[PDB]
Amino acid sequence: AWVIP
Amino acid sequence: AWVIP
Amino acid sequence: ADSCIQFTRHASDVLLNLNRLRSRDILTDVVIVVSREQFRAHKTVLMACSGLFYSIFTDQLKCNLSVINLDPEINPEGFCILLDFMYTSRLNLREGNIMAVMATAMYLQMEHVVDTCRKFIKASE
Amino acid sequence: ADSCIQFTRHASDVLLNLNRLRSRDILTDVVIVVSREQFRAHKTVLMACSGLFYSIFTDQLKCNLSVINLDPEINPEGFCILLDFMYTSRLNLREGNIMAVMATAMYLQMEHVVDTCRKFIKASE
Ligand SMILES: COc1ccc([C@H]2C[C@@H](c3ccc(Cl)cc3)Nc3ncnn32)c(OC)c1OC
Ligand SMILES: COc1ccc([C@H]2C[C@@H](c3ccc(Cl)cc3)Nc3ncnn32)c(OC)c1OC
């Protein structure tokens, strides 16, 4: 996996 | 885009 | 073949276009009913994202239904957030919705979403 | 919302699962006929990848057809290669098939494939 898009 | 996977 | 080239952005572009079809109600083939709310979607996208929908739409009788009613304990906003994640890869997780999102993800059998919900809850305790 | 988190691998995982549905013939809803050959697929994936299929399946009469016949000049192997690209992001481009792949991509209105074919042809001249 999860990221800040 | 295009790459060698 | 082992000689293929790959277009990096293809899978993301396909998903953007499937979400545009959903927004325009093009070729949607099922309505998911969550208490008082209805959501139109494509069975194949639901099956590709959820273990529960994979089981439903591979069943020889349920594959032909045009309406699926979810358990009344499922929160419609939690379902909406997960349906948007299915079609975009982006999850709108907030303090105000995380418990409903996690419960909905457990019911839909979406383990990666359950995992991030558990991590965010654990960080606040 | 601007507060979303994103699962990087989601779009790729969806495409892998849509190709598994195609391999198992699950919820395929159209047959594409290319001369003597038939290919089963999902209309939504075809529309999401091809400008020609987007036009066909948004037409109020053609959206309901279960069989679409392509122009007899289209090469079936060229179509097979492009259908596999639609469902996997990988294009099996070879000296022996590039002209057929490029002609098929022009007909299907798949500009990114046409562009790489033109680049590979130009490099060999
Ligand atoms: C490589 O092995 C498999 C690959 C994919 C599936 C299922 C998983 C199912 C799914 C379940 C959970 C989640 Cl989070 C997302 C998708 N959706 C799907 N569309 C097509 N196939 N499959 C499988 O379940 C039958 C597989 O044998 C374990
Ligand atoms: C952001 O604007 C658009 C986005 C997407 C589409 C079409 C493109 C069409 C497509 C055409 C060519 C290729 Cl290579 C791949 C896909 N497939 C599709 N599925 C859903 N929508 N769309 C559009 O065409 C109506 C758009 O207005 C130009």
Numbering used by the authors:
A (entry chain B), B (entry chain B): 0 to 4
C (entry chain A), D (entry chain A): 5 to 129
Article excerpt on this structure:
We solved the crystal structures of the BCL6 BTB domain bound to 9 different hits at a resolution ranging between 1.38 and 1.85 Å, which corresponds to a 69% success rate. As expected, in all 12 ligand-bound BCL6 structures the compound binds in site 1, which is consistent with the competition with the peptide-based probes in the LO-NMR and FP assays. Despite their low chemical similarity, the different compounds all bind to BCL6 via similar interactions, the vast majority mimicking the interactions of BCL6 with its corepressors SMRT and BCOR. Importantly, all compounds, except the cyano-trifluoromethyl pyridines 11 and 13, interact via an H-bond between an NH group and the main chain carbonyl of Met51 in BCL6 similar to the interaction formed by the Trp509 and His1426 side chains in the BCOR and SMRT corepressor peptides. Additionally, all compounds intercalate between the side chains of Tyr58 and Asn21, as observed for Ile1428 in SMRT and Val511 in BCOR. Furthermore, all compounds except 11 have a substituent that stacks against the main chain of BCL6 residues 53–55, mimicking the interactions of the side chains of His1426 and Trp509 in the SMRT and BCOR peptides. In addition, 17, 2, 11, 14 and 15 all mimic interactions with main chain atoms from both corepressors by forming H-bond networks (direct or water-mediated) with one or more of the following BCL6 residues: Asn21, Arg24 or Arg28.
